[PDB]
């Protein structure tokens, strides 16, 4: 009763491909199932956030892009602020369309050994005490039934594993309707191009000389709550419904309607069926928050579900994914709700824009909103030892020295392993506390480049800290039982 | 063609009485006209803000109250924060009903020489190039026509000088309806006493053992936009309309309905007719902001309009009242709108309460919101010389020393005069720059009690700074032309 794959990941979106890479990184047979025989080819989210730039640099993937310029001044709710006041913060990468991100993740995942299988469509699932058998419509055979120890739903907001798997997916009543298009045809000639006029609002930002990006929301009560694909009819007629400008003669690449519905499943784990990315949470899509949040979901999940399949799988793990990403989810839904109330709203939120504009004068508020939208630092995983200094917080880039070699530690998280940084001393804690050299990485160096921290840290494969130190009376090595196993 | 009074102030509300005191302080015949033959006797706004405690202490009036305890932890939009992080800030006085405030202001104004005249009702006005003739219905004669150089409207939100004087009074469409009562009769037994349930919300705070304060707003679209007095019928039936609790058997002192309409006149001066207090601006009434804002209006206006009538009335003055209080007005309307959106609102503003709760962790945000609601420090009068260090900002209490006498300077602003603080040196600037000893007050002392400022300041009668200094190349004495006259 052998398996086809330890993990069947559903959907070759950014979330699915990232997860496949993580799993495969830590030695896990993974088959990926995607409805589409070709990727969407759609430039949806221009760029991604800076916590995501770091997830990619953790694994050494930034080269695959080519041009990784970053925007220091971004916004919150439409109030532009400087992002570089947070050490390492930024508003994210500027010009990478979703197509390019999925392209390199597909390349990386098949390069690492995953079996991407396009044209397979999940139709059913059954979950037993030792496995999961899924029902996927191959191109060749009408059905084809697969078997794995785990199935992870990385399919869309209209998730399919969610419904048959039994996941409950509650959320917020919709209040605003937003429509997107890459309009390439008869161009627009806008003069009211950012105004909150009565009826709704229009925004336009160019991305090619041919193509312009139409953001188009209207001040109404929606009627078709599900965010779905539409023709140019609605976007053009509603545009003239607000502006009196006709843009009907143009030709779109694609147009879509979405609402500010925010939903999030109550459980990220239901037996052996999972949800990562937009399968787990949805919201009003802009800023690349969905792709960024899904890629970070998948990264947090990857190494956990990876060695869960092999040995060295402790008690708490694979329930720490829910425990660490569900609050993050119910928090980004709250913050995107907040931003768009304060941004899309009319004359009731004018005071809001004013007040926050005033609060952004202060840099404590700057850094607060910084970490809120970047997802770089407000993600401090509340699950830790005492949680006081930098525990569930991530570890930022810092150069290391010759005692190991020149190599700094961003390079260290690239194999999806863990790491432990010591000073060439603390020999007892260097090896009598760590003789798991294959299990994690033990590194010896005088790593103090800049001004902020001091010695005594080992970190998780996703870049989170698990053991803060100074010599604390006893050197606690049971944190390595908290996130790894007791093996010789 | 002699006058009855230099100023006819209309309305013996807090604003009118305060203004009468200021005018009369600086030597101005003032007659006050109030519709009511007896004051309202209503405990409306429990306490007042701390900029108002300072206005009263400027004139040495805090004794007339008796019990001046102050609350250090207040709120913004329902988020409680510590107010004492601002030097001198607080959430204001706790237990003073509006009745007690009007009582002592009436006592002070008639003690200083004003002629309070109850039972006189303004019915008309006519404004000529040299005077104003008003039409007031005395108790004795049916009409009685009065004449003064100026008329100041310190009557209510349903102002009467506003309409005939021709003032344009635009503002915000109403969104929420709020109702107040001092319910003294069959008491309520509340268990859902602060919840934002669907339909609206209920709040109750006790003020006597008999009487409790019913705040009662409902989540609807109002129909009678004008804020007016009502019977207990509506408050009781709407209460059960939200809670299913019947409080109909009780007996109120008074009940009133109000909306979140915020209005503000475009001009505070229209010829020789004025608006101070709720005659100039209105909003959703809670927190004592209306009485506090009106009392500060009246204080800013008082000494200006006072010596405007006598000689020594410069060019810019009596247009600086509009120039200095209209932005303050259009700002408090914005901030009360903001608070109550974030407080009274339902599930759309939940993220709002969350975000500000997070931002209040930071004390820069604390002090910002501090100064916003206290009106103690965000009122920095933008009209000044360069406006850079503490110009249009007010001057806080600080002890002075024996070179004058023990007396510190809160005592100095009590005669409604100006003042100038020097160190016993700078003799040339002490008297060759200031030989207006009667016009302003020249004080000599080593005033450095605590840590914050250094020497070189003269201040306006309302407590605002007009001449910052250090020795600046030249000692500019033309600021004394900016707010006083050139007289020997
Ligand atoms: C048209 C459009 C425009 C967008 N524009 C923006 C934007 O401008 N800014 C922004 O921030 N966000 C935007 N978004 C949202 C953002 O693109 C998504 O959040 C992002 O793609 C993350 O999705 P994911 O990683 O969960 O996978 P998704 O991209 O949601 O893809 C899910 C994958 O699962 C596959 N799948 C679905 N059903 C099945 C099935 N039964 N069997 C097998 N495979 C299946 C799908 O075909 C797809 O390959 C946009 C989304 C869309 C659709
Ligand atoms: C019932 C009630 C409850 C309130 N509760 C609160 C509360 O809980 N918290 C809060 O912060 N604020 C509250 N307010 C608002 C606050 O009391 C007012 O903003 C405050 O009184 C400031 O008004 P004012 O100083 O401009 O004069 P007002 O108090 O408005 O009085 C105006 C005066 O002008 C007189 N007048 C009117 N028309 C004429 C005329 N034609 N001729 C002559 N005189 C005239 C009136 O009779 C009155 O004496 C309440 C107001 C009311 C009415």
TrEMBL record, chains A, B:
GO MF term list: FAD binding; oxidoreductase activity, acting on paired donors, with incorporation or reduction of molecular oxygen, NAD(P)H as one donor, and incorporation of one atom of oxygen
Residues given in the record as FAD binding sites: 15, 34, 44, 98, 122, 160, 213, 278, 288
All copies of domain FAD-binding, residue ranges: 5-335
SUPFAM superfamilies, sorted: FAD/NAD(P)-binding domain
Keywords attached to this entry: FAD, Flavoprotein, Monooxygenase, Nucleotide-binding, Oxidoreductase
Record keyword Transmembrane helix present: no
InterPro entries: FAD-bd, FAD/NAD-bd_sf, RIFMO-like
Gene3D superfamilies per the UniProt record, alphabetical: 3.40.30.120, FAD/NAD(P)-binding domain
A Pfam entry, by short name: FAD_binding_3
Keyword flag Kinase: no
Protein name: Monooxygenase
Gene label: alpK
């Amino acid at each position: 009763e052998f398996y086809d794959s330890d993990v069947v990941v559903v959907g070759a979106g950014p979330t699915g491909l990232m997860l496949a890479g993580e799993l495969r990184l830590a030695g896990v047979s993974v088959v990926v199932l995607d409805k589409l025989a070709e990727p969407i080819k759609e430039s949806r989210a221009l760029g991604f956030s800076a916590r995501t730039i770091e997830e990619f640099a953790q694994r050494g993937l930034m080269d695959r892009f080519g041009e990784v310029g970053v925007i220091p001044v971004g916004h919150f709710g439409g109030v532009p602020l400087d992002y570089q006041v947070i050490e390492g913060g930024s508003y994210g990468a500027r010009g990478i369309p979703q197509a390019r991100t999925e392209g390199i993740l597909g390349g990386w995942a098949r390069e690492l050994g995953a079996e991407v299988r396009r044209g397979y469509e999940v139709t059913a699932i059954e979950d037993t005490g030792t496995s999961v058998t899924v029902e996927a419509a191959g191109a060749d055979g009408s059905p084809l039934s697969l078997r794995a120890r785990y199935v992870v739903g990385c399919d869309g907001a209209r998730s399919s594993v969610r419904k048959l798997a039994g996941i409950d997916f509650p959320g917020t009543e919709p209040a605003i309707e937003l429509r997107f298009a890459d309009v390439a045809g008869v161009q627009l000639r806008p003069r009211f191009s950012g105004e909150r006029v009565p009826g709704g609002m229009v925004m336009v930002l160019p991305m090619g000389p041919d193509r312009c990006r139409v953001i188009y929301f209207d001040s109404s009560q929606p009627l078709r709550t599900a965010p779905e694909a539409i023709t140019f009819e609605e976007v053009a007629d509603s545009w003239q419904r607000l502006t009196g400008e006709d843009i009907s003669g143009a030709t779109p690449l694609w147009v879509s309607s979405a609402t500010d519905v925010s939903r999030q499943a109550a459980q990220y784990r239901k037996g052996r069926v999972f949800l990562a990315g937009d399968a787990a949470h949805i919201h009003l899509p802009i800023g690349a928050q969905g792709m960024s949040a899904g890629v970070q979901d998948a990264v947090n999940l990857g190494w956990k579900l990876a060695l869960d399949i092999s040995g060295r799988a402790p008690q708490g793990l694979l329930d720490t994914y829910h425990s660490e990403r569900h609050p993050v989810g119910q928090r980004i839904l709250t913050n995107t709700l907040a931003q768009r109330i304060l941004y899309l709203g009319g004359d009731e939120i004018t005071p809001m824009r004013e007040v926050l504009a005033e609060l952004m004068g202060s840099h404590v508020s700057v850094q607060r909103h910084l970490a809120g939208m970047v997802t770089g630092l407000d993600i401090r995983h509340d699950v830790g030892e005492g949680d006081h200094p930098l525990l569930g917080r991530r570890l930022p880039d810092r150069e290391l020295v010759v005692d190991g070699e020149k190599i700094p530690f961003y390079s260290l998280l690239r194999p999806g392993r863990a790491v432990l940084l010591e000073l060439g001393g603390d020999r007892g804690l260097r090896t009598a506390a760590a003789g798991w050299a294959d299990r994690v990485d033990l590194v010896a160096a005088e790593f103090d480049g800049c001004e902020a921290p001091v010695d005594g840290i080992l970190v998780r494969p996703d870049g989170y800290v698990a053991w803060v130190a100074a010599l604390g009376a006893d050197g606690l090595t049971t944190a390595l039982d908290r996130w790894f196993g007791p093996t010789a």
